[PDB]
PDB file of C-alpha atoms in Angstrom:
ATOM      1  CA  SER A   5      -4.081  11.012 -26.070  1.00  0.00           C
ATOM      2  CA  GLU A   6      -1.294   8.875 -24.699  1.00  0.00           C
ATOM      3  CA  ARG A   7      -0.478   9.445 -20.991  1.00  0.00           C
ATOM      4  CA  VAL A   8       2.408   8.670 -18.508  1.00  0.00           C
ATOM      5  CA  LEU A   9       0.351   6.950 -15.745  1.00  0.00           C
ATOM      6  CA  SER A  10       0.310   8.785 -12.461  1.00  0.00           C
ATOM      7  CA  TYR A  11      -1.181   7.417  -8.997  1.00  0.00           C
ATOM      8  CA  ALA A  12      -3.138   8.412  -6.120  1.00  0.00           C
ATOM      9  CA  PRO A  13      -2.223   7.702  -2.353  1.00  0.00           C
ATOM     10  CA  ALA A  14      -3.133   4.146  -1.517  1.00  0.00           C
ATOM     11  CA  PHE A  15      -4.604   4.649   2.104  1.00  0.00           C
ATOM     12  CA  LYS A  16      -5.493   7.205   4.590  1.00  0.00           C
ATOM     13  CA  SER A  17      -4.893   6.389   8.302  1.00  0.00           C
ATOM     14  CA  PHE A  18      -6.986   6.781  11.046  1.00  0.00           C
ATOM     15  CA  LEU A  19      -5.705   5.631  14.489  1.00  0.00           C
ATOM     16  CA  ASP A  20      -8.580   5.468  17.084  1.00  0.00           C
ATOM     17  CA  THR A  21      -7.880   6.309  20.664  1.00  0.00           C
ATOM     18  CA  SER A  22      -7.858   2.622  21.529  1.00  0.00           C
ATOM     19  CA  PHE A  23      -4.782   2.130  19.216  1.00  0.00           C
ATOM     20  CA  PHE A  24      -2.870   4.568  21.307  1.00  0.00           C
ATOM     21  CA  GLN A  25      -4.077   3.219  24.500  1.00  0.00           C
ATOM     22  CA  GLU A  26      -2.873   0.015  23.413  1.00  0.00           C
ATOM     23  CA  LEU A  27       0.454   1.180  22.214  1.00  0.00           C
ATOM     24  CA  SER A  28       0.762   2.893  25.593  1.00  0.00           C
ATOM     25  CA  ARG A  29       0.279  -0.506  27.354  1.00  0.00           C
ATOM     26  CA  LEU A  30       3.027  -1.923  24.807  1.00  0.00           C
ATOM     27  CA  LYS A  31       5.624   0.933  25.467  1.00  0.00           C
ATOM     28  CA  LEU A  32       5.329   0.402  29.411  1.00  0.00           C
ATOM     29  CA  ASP A  33       6.133  -3.314  28.641  1.00  0.00           C
ATOM     30  CA  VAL A  34       9.295  -2.239  27.100  1.00  0.00           C
ATOM     31  CA  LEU A  35      10.379   0.954  28.878  1.00  0.00           C
ATOM     32  CA  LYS A  36      13.983  -0.114  29.436  1.00  0.00           C
ATOM     33  CA  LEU A  37      14.592  -0.578  25.458  1.00  0.00           C
ATOM     34  CA  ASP A  38      15.437   1.929  22.670  1.00  0.00           C
ATOM     35  CA  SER A  39      12.626   0.653  20.679  1.00  0.00           C
ATOM     36  CA  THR A  40      10.216  -2.280  19.456  1.00  0.00           C
ATOM     37  CA  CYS A  41       8.673  -3.346  16.440  1.00  0.00           C
ATOM     38  CA  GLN A  42       5.203  -5.129  16.512  1.00  0.00           C
ATOM     39  CA  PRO A  43       2.928  -6.878  13.779  1.00  0.00           C
ATOM     40  CA  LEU A  44      -0.401  -5.215  13.011  1.00  0.00           C
ATOM     41  CA  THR A  45      -3.545  -6.537  10.927  1.00  0.00           C
ATOM     42  CA  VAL A  46      -6.112  -4.284   9.613  1.00  0.00           C
ATOM     43  CA  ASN A  47      -9.268  -5.418   7.573  1.00  0.00           C
ATOM     44  CA  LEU A  48     -10.053  -3.404   4.702  1.00  0.00           C
ATOM     45  CA  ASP A  49     -13.487  -2.627   3.746  1.00  0.00           C
ATOM     46  CA  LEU A  50     -13.566  -1.442   0.066  1.00  0.00           C
ATOM     47  CA  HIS A  51     -17.565  -1.310  -0.164  1.00  0.00           C
ATOM     48  CA  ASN A  52     -17.956   1.340   2.352  1.00  0.00           C
ATOM     49  CA  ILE A  53     -15.334   4.044   1.314  1.00  0.00           C
ATOM     50  CA  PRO A  54     -16.923   7.573   2.201  1.00  0.00           C
ATOM     51  CA  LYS A  55     -18.157   9.335  -0.939  1.00  0.00           C
ATOM     52  CA  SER A  56     -16.006  12.163  -0.085  1.00  0.00           C
ATOM     53  CA  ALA A  57     -12.832  10.256   0.771  1.00  0.00           C
ATOM     54  CA  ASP A  58     -10.142   9.565  -2.065  1.00  0.00           C
ATOM     55  CA  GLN A  59      -9.038   6.227  -0.856  1.00  0.00           C
ATOM     56  CA  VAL A  60      -9.512   3.366   1.529  1.00  0.00           C
ATOM     57  CA  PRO A  61      -8.987   4.267   5.245  1.00  0.00           C
ATOM     58  CA  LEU A  62      -6.855   2.401   7.626  1.00  0.00           C
ATOM     59  CA  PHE A  63      -8.931   2.273  10.824  1.00  0.00           C
ATOM     60  CA  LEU A  64      -6.530   1.259  13.421  1.00  0.00           C
ATOM     61  CA  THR A  65      -7.529   0.240  16.802  1.00  0.00           C
ATOM     62  CA  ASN A  66      -6.493  -1.908  19.920  1.00  0.00           C
ATOM     63  CA  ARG A  67      -7.426  -4.929  18.031  1.00  0.00           C
ATOM     64  CA  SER A  68      -4.937  -4.360  15.016  1.00  0.00           C
ATOM     65  CA  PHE A  69      -2.302  -5.612  17.427  1.00  0.00           C
ATOM     66  CA  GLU A  70      -4.142  -8.748  18.185  1.00  0.00           C
ATOM     67  CA  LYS A  71      -4.692 -12.047  16.083  1.00  0.00           C
ATOM     68  CA  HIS A  72      -8.580 -11.768  15.997  1.00  0.00           C
ATOM     69  CA  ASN A  73     -10.866 -13.723  13.673  1.00  0.00           C
ATOM     70  CA  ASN A  74     -12.773 -10.596  13.452  1.00  0.00           C
ATOM     71  CA  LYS A  75     -12.801 -10.444   9.673  1.00  0.00           C
ATOM     72  CA  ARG A  76     -16.149  -9.587   7.963  1.00  0.00           C
ATOM     73  CA  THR A  77     -17.366 -10.803   4.662  1.00  0.00           C
ATOM     74  CA  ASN A  78     -15.452  -9.508   1.710  1.00  0.00           C
ATOM     75  CA  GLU A  79     -12.958  -7.652   3.914  1.00  0.00           C
ATOM     76  CA  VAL A  80      -9.342  -7.722   2.723  1.00  0.00           C
ATOM     77  CA  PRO A  81      -6.726  -8.478   5.374  1.00  0.00           C
ATOM     78  CA  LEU A  82      -3.732  -6.071   5.208  1.00  0.00           C
ATOM     79  CA  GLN A  83      -0.668  -6.986   7.334  1.00  0.00           C
ATOM     80  CA  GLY A  84       1.825  -4.205   8.545  1.00  0.00           C
ATOM     81  CA  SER A  85       3.842  -3.352  11.739  1.00  0.00           C
ATOM     82  CA  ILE A  86       4.303  -0.384  14.003  1.00  0.00           C
ATOM     83  CA  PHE A  87       7.889   0.585  14.879  1.00  0.00           C
ATOM     84  CA  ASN A  88       7.797   2.650  18.219  1.00  0.00           C
ATOM     85  CA  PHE A  89      10.704   4.863  19.462  1.00  0.00           C
ATOM     86  CA  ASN A  90      11.050   5.220  23.088  1.00  0.00           C
ATOM     87  CA  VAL A  91      13.079   8.342  22.592  1.00  0.00           C
ATOM     88  CA  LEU A  92      11.702  11.474  20.525  1.00  0.00           C
ATOM     89  CA  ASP A  93      15.182  12.381  19.117  1.00  0.00           C
ATOM     90  CA  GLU A  94      15.679   8.799  17.412  1.00  0.00           C
ATOM     91  CA  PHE A  95      12.050   9.194  15.883  1.00  0.00           C
ATOM     92  CA  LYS A  96      13.081  12.556  14.471  1.00  0.00           C
ATOM     93  CA  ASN A  97      16.353  11.523  13.097  1.00  0.00           C
ATOM     94  CA  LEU A  98      15.370   8.207  11.673  1.00  0.00           C
ATOM     95  CA  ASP A  99      16.271   8.302   7.792  1.00  0.00           C
ATOM     96  CA  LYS A 100      12.810   8.114   6.516  1.00  0.00           C
ATOM     97  CA  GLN A 101      13.600   7.339   2.904  1.00  0.00           C
ATOM     98  CA  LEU A 102      16.061   4.689   3.737  1.00  0.00           C
ATOM     99  CA  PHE A 103      13.566   2.993   6.176  1.00  0.00           C
ATOM    100  CA  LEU A 104      10.543   3.120   3.870  1.00  0.00           C
ATOM    101  CA  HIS A 105      13.051   1.751   1.092  1.00  0.00           C
ATOM    102  CA  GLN A 106      13.829  -1.336   3.284  1.00  0.00           C
ATOM    103  CA  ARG A 107       9.830  -1.940   3.866  1.00  0.00           C
ATOM    104  CA  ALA A 108       9.566  -1.954   0.066  1.00  0.00           C
ATOM    105  CA  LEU A 109      12.387  -4.422  -0.373  1.00  0.00           C
ATOM    106  CA  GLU A 110      10.691  -6.922   1.903  1.00  0.00           C
ATOM    107  CA  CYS A 111       7.390  -6.515  -0.154  1.00  0.00           C
ATOM    108  CA  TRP A 112       9.377  -6.992  -3.382  1.00  0.00           C
ATOM    109  CA  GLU A 113      10.776 -10.212  -1.773  1.00  0.00           C
ATOM    110  CA  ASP A 114       7.549 -11.314  -0.756  1.00  0.00           C
ATOM    111  CA  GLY A 115       5.932 -10.392  -4.279  1.00  0.00           C
ATOM    112  CA  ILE A 116       8.218 -12.122  -6.547  1.00  0.00           C
ATOM    113  CA  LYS A 117       7.144 -15.457  -4.606  1.00  0.00           C
ATOM    114  CA  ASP A 118       3.491 -14.483  -4.502  1.00  0.00           C
ATOM    115  CA  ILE A 119       2.207 -11.138  -6.330  1.00  0.00           C
ATOM    116  CA  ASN A 120      -0.659 -11.017  -3.874  1.00  0.00           C
ATOM    117  CA  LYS A 121       1.695 -10.482  -1.022  1.00  0.00           C
ATOM    118  CA  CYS A 122       3.496  -7.462  -2.237  1.00  0.00           C
ATOM    119  CA  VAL A 123       1.466  -4.997  -0.316  1.00  0.00           C
ATOM    120  CA  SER A 124       1.881  -3.821   3.358  1.00  0.00           C
ATOM    121  CA  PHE A 125       2.112  -0.777   5.698  1.00  0.00           C
ATOM    122  CA  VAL A 126       4.085   0.564   8.409  1.00  0.00           C
ATOM    123  CA  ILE A 127       3.496   2.972  11.419  1.00  0.00           C
ATOM    124  CA  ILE A 128       6.690   4.627  12.997  1.00  0.00           C
ATOM    125  CA  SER A 129       5.607   6.144  16.310  1.00  0.00           C
ATOM    126  CA  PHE A 130       6.835   7.968  19.415  1.00  0.00           C
ATOM    127  CA  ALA A 131       4.444   7.813  22.338  1.00  0.00           C
ATOM    128  CA  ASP A 132       5.010  10.692  24.828  1.00  0.00           C
ATOM    129  CA  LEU A 133       3.474   9.187  27.964  1.00  0.00           C
ATOM    130  CA  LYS A 134       4.231  12.189  30.096  1.00  0.00           C
ATOM    131  CA  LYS A 135       2.231  14.682  27.855  1.00  0.00           C
ATOM    132  CA  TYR A 136       0.081  11.838  26.500  1.00  0.00           C
ATOM    133  CA  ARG A 137       0.771  13.232  23.119  1.00  0.00           C
ATOM    134  CA  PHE A 138       1.434  10.600  20.236  1.00  0.00           C
ATOM    135  CA  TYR A 139       3.469  11.206  17.286  1.00  0.00           C
ATOM    136  CA  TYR A 140       2.980   8.836  14.367  1.00  0.00           C
ATOM    137  CA  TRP A 141       3.587   8.466  10.657  1.00  0.00           C
ATOM    138  CA  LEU A 142       2.223   6.046   8.220  1.00  0.00           C
ATOM    139  CA  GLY A 143       4.024   4.645   5.484  1.00  0.00           C
ATOM    140  CA  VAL A 144       2.589   2.490   2.682  1.00  0.00           C
ATOM    141  CA  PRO A 145       5.789   1.278   0.582  1.00  0.00           C
ATOM    142  CA  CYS A 146       4.778   1.834  -3.254  1.00  0.00           C
ATOM    143  CA  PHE A 147       7.750   0.750  -5.433  1.00  0.00           C
ATOM    144  CA  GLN A 148       8.709   0.795  -8.923  1.00  0.00           C
ATOM    145  CA  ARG A 149      11.544  -1.694  -9.749  1.00  0.00           C
ATOM    146  CA  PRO A 150      13.271  -1.066 -11.922  1.00  0.00           C
ATOM    147  CA  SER A 151      13.096   2.699 -11.090  1.00  0.00           C
ATOM    148  CA  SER A 152      13.227   3.474 -14.755  1.00  0.00           C
ATOM    149  CA  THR A 153      10.040   1.558 -15.612  1.00  0.00           C
ATOM    150  CA  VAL A 154       6.903   3.881 -16.239  1.00  0.00           C
ATOM    151  CA  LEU A 155       3.517   3.103 -18.110  1.00  0.00           C
ATOM    152  CA  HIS A 156       2.171   4.884 -21.062  1.00  0.00           C
ATOM    153  CA  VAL A 157      -1.708   4.624 -21.094  1.00  0.00           C
ATOM    154  CA  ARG A 158      -4.772   5.517 -22.766  1.00  0.00           C
ATOM    155  CA  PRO A 159      -8.503   4.877 -22.181  1.00  0.00           C
ATOM    156  CA  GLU A 160     -10.070   1.359 -22.942  1.00  0.00           C
ATOM    157  CA  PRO A 161     -13.909   1.611 -23.174  1.00  0.00           C
ATOM    158  CA  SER A 162     -14.253  -2.018 -24.765  1.00  0.00           C
ATOM    159  CA  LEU A 163     -13.410  -3.762 -21.544  1.00  0.00           C
ATOM    160  CA  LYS A 164     -16.365  -2.233 -19.385  1.00  0.00           C
ATOM    161  CA  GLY A 165     -18.109  -5.719 -19.441  1.00  0.00           C
ATOM    162  CA  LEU A 166     -15.370  -7.447 -17.345  1.00  0.00           C
ATOM    163  CA  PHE A 167     -15.864  -5.065 -14.258  1.00  0.00           C
ATOM    164  CA  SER A 168     -18.758  -6.848 -12.629  1.00  0.00           C
ATOM    165  CA  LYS A 169     -17.139 -10.323 -12.842  1.00  0.00           C
ATOM    166  CA  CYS A 170     -13.708  -8.986 -11.369  1.00  0.00           C
ATOM    167  CA  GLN A 171     -15.578  -6.957  -8.713  1.00  0.00           C
ATOM    168  CA  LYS A 172     -17.215 -10.195  -7.580  1.00  0.00           C
ATOM    169  CA  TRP A 173     -14.142 -12.651  -8.049  1.00  0.00           C
ATOM    170  CA  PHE A 174     -12.252 -10.135  -5.621  1.00  0.00           C
ATOM    171  CA  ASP A 175     -15.255 -10.048  -3.052  1.00  0.00           C
ATOM    172  CA  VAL A 176     -14.950 -13.847  -3.135  1.00  0.00           C
ATOM    173  CA  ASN A 177     -11.073 -14.080  -3.116  1.00  0.00           C
ATOM    174  CA  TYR A 178     -10.433 -11.815  -0.198  1.00  0.00           C
ATOM    175  CA  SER A 179      -6.762 -12.610   0.034  1.00  0.00           C
ATOM    176  CA  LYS A 180      -6.178 -11.603  -3.515  1.00  0.00           C
ATOM    177  CA  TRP A 181      -5.095  -8.017  -5.112  1.00  0.00           C
ATOM    178  CA  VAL A 182      -4.540  -9.417  -8.735  1.00  0.00           C
ATOM    179  CA  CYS A 183      -6.573 -11.571 -11.202  1.00  0.00           C
ATOM    180  CA  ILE A 184      -6.008 -11.966 -14.829  1.00  0.00           C
ATOM    181  CA  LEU A 185      -8.140 -13.352 -17.836  1.00  0.00           C
ATOM    182  CA  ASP A 186      -7.119 -16.730 -19.288  1.00  0.00           C
ATOM    183  CA  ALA A 187      -7.713 -17.928 -22.768  1.00  0.00           C
ATOM    184  CA  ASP A 188     -11.479 -18.363 -22.413  1.00  0.00           C
ATOM    185  CA  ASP A 189     -11.917 -15.010 -20.956  1.00  0.00           C
ATOM    186  CA  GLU A 190     -12.681 -16.351 -17.467  1.00  0.00           C
ATOM    187  CA  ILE A 191     -11.058 -14.532 -14.342  1.00  0.00           C
ATOM    188  CA  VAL A 192      -8.404 -16.659 -12.685  1.00  0.00           C
ATOM    189  CA  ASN A 193      -5.434 -16.340 -10.347  1.00  0.00           C
ATOM    190  CA  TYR A 194      -2.389 -14.594 -11.436  1.00  0.00           C
ATOM    191  CA  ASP A 195      -0.017 -17.108 -13.231  1.00  0.00           C
ATOM    192  CA  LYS A 196       2.695 -15.742 -15.026  1.00  0.00           C
ATOM    193  CA  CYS A 197       2.567 -18.435 -18.036  1.00  0.00           C
ATOM    194  CA  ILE A 198      -1.127 -17.496 -18.596  1.00  0.00           C
ATOM    195  CA  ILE A 199      -0.874 -13.629 -18.656  1.00  0.00           C
ATOM    196  CA  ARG A 200       2.166 -13.793 -20.886  1.00  0.00           C
ATOM    197  CA  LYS A 201      -0.292 -15.001 -23.444  1.00  0.00           C
ATOM    198  CA  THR A 202      -3.436 -13.219 -22.567  1.00  0.00           C
ATOM    199  CA  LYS A 203      -1.972  -9.952 -21.309  1.00  0.00           C
ATOM    200  CA  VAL A 204      -5.142  -8.840 -19.296  1.00  0.00           C
ATOM    201  CA  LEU A 205      -4.423  -7.887 -15.772  1.00  0.00           C
ATOM    202  CA  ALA A 206      -6.958  -6.681 -12.986  1.00  0.00           C
ATOM    203  CA  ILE A 207      -5.954  -5.053  -9.612  1.00  0.00           C
ATOM    204  CA  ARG A 208      -7.994  -4.433  -6.614  1.00  0.00           C
ATOM    205  CA  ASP A 209      -7.676  -0.638  -6.326  1.00  0.00           C
ATOM    206  CA  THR A 210      -7.773   1.122  -3.015  1.00  0.00           C
ATOM    207  CA  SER A 211      -8.299   4.658  -4.378  1.00  0.00           C
ATOM    208  CA  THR A 212     -11.537   6.287  -5.541  1.00  0.00           C
ATOM    209  CA  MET A 213     -10.005   9.274  -7.413  1.00  0.00           C
ATOM    210  CA  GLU A 214     -11.535   9.370 -10.786  1.00  0.00           C
ATOM    211  CA  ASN A 215      -9.441   7.612 -13.438  1.00  0.00           C
ATOM    212  CA  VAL A 216      -6.485   7.775 -11.092  1.00  0.00           C
ATOM    213  CA  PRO A 217      -5.264   4.312  -9.593  1.00  0.00           C
ATOM    214  CA  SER A 218      -3.825   3.657  -6.332  1.00  0.00           C
ATOM    215  CA  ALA A 219       0.136   3.970  -6.034  1.00  0.00           C
ATOM    216  CA  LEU A 220       0.088   0.275  -5.003  1.00  0.00           C
ATOM    217  CA  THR A 221      -0.256  -0.495  -8.666  1.00  0.00           C
ATOM    218  CA  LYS A 222       3.507   0.118  -9.152  1.00  0.00           C
ATOM    219  CA  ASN A 223       4.081  -2.698  -6.677  1.00  0.00           C
ATOM    220  CA  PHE A 224       2.078  -5.095  -8.824  1.00  0.00           C
ATOM    221  CA  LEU A 225       3.363  -4.037 -12.134  1.00  0.00           C
ATOM    222  CA  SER A 226       7.004  -4.135 -10.792  1.00  0.00           C
ATOM    223  CA  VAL A 227       6.341  -7.878 -10.120  1.00  0.00           C
ATOM    224  CA  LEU A 228       4.492  -8.415 -13.584  1.00  0.00           C
ATOM    225  CA  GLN A 229       7.610  -6.976 -15.423  1.00  0.00           C
ATOM    226  CA  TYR A 230       9.982  -9.300 -13.540  1.00  0.00           C
ATOM    227  CA  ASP A 231       7.856 -12.162 -14.448  1.00  0.00           C
ATOM    228  CA  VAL A 232       7.389 -11.355 -18.120  1.00  0.00           C
ATOM    229  CA  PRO A 233      10.442  -9.183 -18.902  1.00  0.00           C
ATOM    230  CA  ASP A 234       9.601  -8.741 -22.616  1.00  0.00           C
ATOM    231  CA  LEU A 235       5.765  -7.801 -22.003  1.00  0.00           C
ATOM    232  CA  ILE A 236       5.351  -4.500 -23.774  1.00  0.00           C
ATOM    233  CA  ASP A 237       1.626  -3.924 -24.274  1.00  0.00           C
ATOM    234  CA  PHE A 238      -1.116  -5.099 -22.323  1.00  0.00           C
ATOM    235  CA  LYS A 239      -4.633  -4.303 -20.562  1.00  0.00           C
ATOM    236  CA  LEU A 240      -4.803  -3.087 -17.209  1.00  0.00           C
ATOM    237  CA  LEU A 241      -8.163  -3.030 -15.428  1.00  0.00           C
ATOM    238  CA  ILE A 242      -8.533  -0.988 -12.386  1.00  0.00           C
ATOM    239  CA  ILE A 243     -11.415  -2.538 -10.226  1.00  0.00           C
ATOM    240  CA  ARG A 244     -13.308  -0.612  -7.581  1.00  0.00           C
ATOM    241  CA  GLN A 245     -16.242  -1.748  -5.616  1.00  0.00           C
ATOM    242  CA  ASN A 246     -18.230   1.570  -6.815  1.00  0.00           C
ATOM    243  CA  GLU A 247     -19.034   2.604 -10.248  1.00  0.00           C
ATOM    244  CA  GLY A 248     -15.547   3.952 -11.021  1.00  0.00           C
ATOM    245  CA  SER A 249     -13.710   0.880 -12.252  1.00  0.00           C
ATOM    246  CA  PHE A 250     -11.919   1.736 -15.468  1.00  0.00           C
ATOM    247  CA  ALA A 251      -9.619   0.051 -18.029  1.00  0.00           C
ATOM    248  CA  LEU A 252      -6.405   1.287 -19.563  1.00  0.00           C
ATOM    249  CA  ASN A 253      -4.461   0.043 -22.709  1.00  0.00           C
ATOM    250  CA  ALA A 254      -1.087   0.055 -21.285  1.00  0.00           C
ATOM    251  CA  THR A 255       2.467  -0.013 -22.642  1.00  0.00           C
ATOM    252  CA  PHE A 256       5.874  -0.500 -20.377  1.00  0.00           C
ATOM    253  CA  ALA A 257       8.287   2.347 -21.255  1.00  0.00           C
ATOM    254  CA  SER A 258      11.455   3.293 -19.547  1.00  0.00           C
ATOM    255  CA  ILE A 259      13.413   6.618 -18.624  1.00  0.00           C
ATOM    256  CA  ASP A 260      17.049   6.307 -18.145  1.00  0.00           C
ATOM    257  CA  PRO A 261      17.151   2.574 -17.903  1.00  0.00           C
ATOM    258  CA  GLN A 262      20.458   0.917 -16.263  1.00  0.00           C
ATOM    259  CA  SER A 263      22.699  -1.269 -18.132  1.00  0.00           C
ATOM    260  CA  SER A 264      21.179  -4.471 -18.824  1.00  0.00           C
ATOM    261  CA  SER A 265      22.281  -7.270 -16.243  1.00  0.00           C
ATOM    262  CA  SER A 266      22.986  -4.845 -13.712  1.00  0.00           C
ATOM    263  CA  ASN A 267      21.319  -5.145 -10.251  1.00  0.00           C
ATOM    264  CA  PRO A 268      17.766  -3.241 -10.956  1.00  0.00           C
ATOM    265  CA  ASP A 269      17.277  -0.330  -8.414  1.00  0.00           C
ATOM    266  CA  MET A 270      13.922   0.634  -7.143  1.00  0.00           C
ATOM    267  CA  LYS A 271      11.954   4.066  -6.549  1.00  0.00           C
ATOM    268  CA  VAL A 272       9.937   4.272  -3.462  1.00  0.00           C
ATOM    269  CA  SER A 273       7.427   6.378  -2.132  1.00  0.00           C
ATOM    270  CA  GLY A 274       4.323   6.307   0.026  1.00  0.00           C
ATOM    271  CA  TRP A 275       4.830   8.294   3.336  1.00  0.00           C
ATOM    272  CA  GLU A 276       1.399   9.936   4.358  1.00  0.00           C
ATOM    273  CA  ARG A 277       0.800  13.622   3.998  1.00  0.00           C
ATOM    274  CA  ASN A 278      -0.126  15.317   7.384  1.00  0.00           C
ATOM    275  CA  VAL A 279      -2.751  17.802   8.243  1.00  0.00           C
ATOM    276  CA  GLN A 280      -1.091  20.588   6.192  1.00  0.00           C
ATOM    277  CA  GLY A 281      -0.623  18.289   3.358  1.00  0.00           C
ATOM    278  CA  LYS A 282       3.196  18.189   4.023  1.00  0.00           C
ATOM    279  CA  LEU A 283       5.362  14.821   4.122  1.00  0.00           C
ATOM    280  CA  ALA A 284       5.580  15.081   7.938  1.00  0.00           C
ATOM    281  CA  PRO A 285       4.296  13.186  10.998  1.00  0.00           C
ATOM    282  CA  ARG A 286       0.866  13.468  12.507  1.00  0.00           C
ATOM    283  CA  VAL A 287       0.405  14.314  16.231  1.00  0.00           C
ATOM    284  CA  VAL A 288      -2.752  13.201  18.445  1.00  0.00           C
ATOM    285  CA  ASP A 289      -3.493  14.514  22.042  1.00  0.00           C
ATOM    286  CA  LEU A 290      -5.274  12.081  24.473  1.00  0.00           C
TER     287      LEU A 290
ATOM    288  CA  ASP B   4       7.287  22.906  20.445  1.00  0.00           C
ATOM    289  CA  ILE B   5       4.867  20.795  18.442  1.00  0.00           C
ATOM    290  CA  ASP B   6       5.075  22.893  15.366  1.00  0.00           C
ATOM    291  CA  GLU B   7       9.078  23.072  15.528  1.00  0.00           C
ATOM    292  CA  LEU B   8       9.309  19.344  15.764  1.00  0.00           C
ATOM    293  CA  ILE B   9       6.845  18.532  12.694  1.00  0.00           C
ATOM    294  CA  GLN B  10       8.846  21.098  10.361  1.00  0.00           C
ATOM    295  CA  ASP B  11      12.079  19.568  11.486  1.00  0.00           C
ATOM    296  CA  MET B  12      10.766  16.068  10.250  1.00  0.00           C
ATOM    297  CA  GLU B  13       9.396  17.370   7.028  1.00  0.00           C
ATOM    298  CA  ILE B  14      10.915  15.283   4.002  1.00  0.00           C
ATOM    299  CA  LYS B  15      11.165  15.802   0.243  1.00  0.00           C
TER     300      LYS B  15
END
């Protein structure tokens, strides 16, 4: 009955025509450069996920490039960036693992200051304005640090009562990805001194796959383990805005750990799969 | 050569 936790892809991309139109404007602005990197923002809607989708879509438009106050109620802002190559060869030859790894390290550095900031996304692109074809690849850095850490889990029915409280807490606290129980069983913001004692953590989940949490869970668990290095057993609530929230009795375990007091490494995944289900770029024609 | 490019960029 005790399983090694596995995960689902955190997001699926949809880049609207207007995104590529706006990218085109951007590229024409920096035609003489090898590349540019620009910030993006998307507002995630976790209440209106298609019944047939497996996770939250990332719906990108021209407005994603801008600092709009266009957020609707309960939407979760997510920050990322687009790295656009002006030469297709550079796009092709970019070492994708090293690149996503570096994005993960930034999430990590943000995460240890604030667990709620250890999530982001990146788009790498090449815009062929001659053929009006756009190549892009979404990456969502999901990391396990140290790379040796895994989680043993088994179902925990008893915590079903907390789900609606978390659902509402998350709706209101739109900038938060994590909450925990305090000593009075009330939901509060993550605080390492408190969870160390109460050992109940809830995560805002972006997947809809039955009983399989989003790979972003690894980011949060990594920060948790850094903050509370001797935490072993705890309860993990996976909170969704549909009926599919679930709870796990969790235990940190390790495979092939590094010697204590070495610089812990990290394992990183999160490149989006394409139309054929391969780890490869997507292509769009305008 | 779209199909060729995508194949060359596939990772593991």
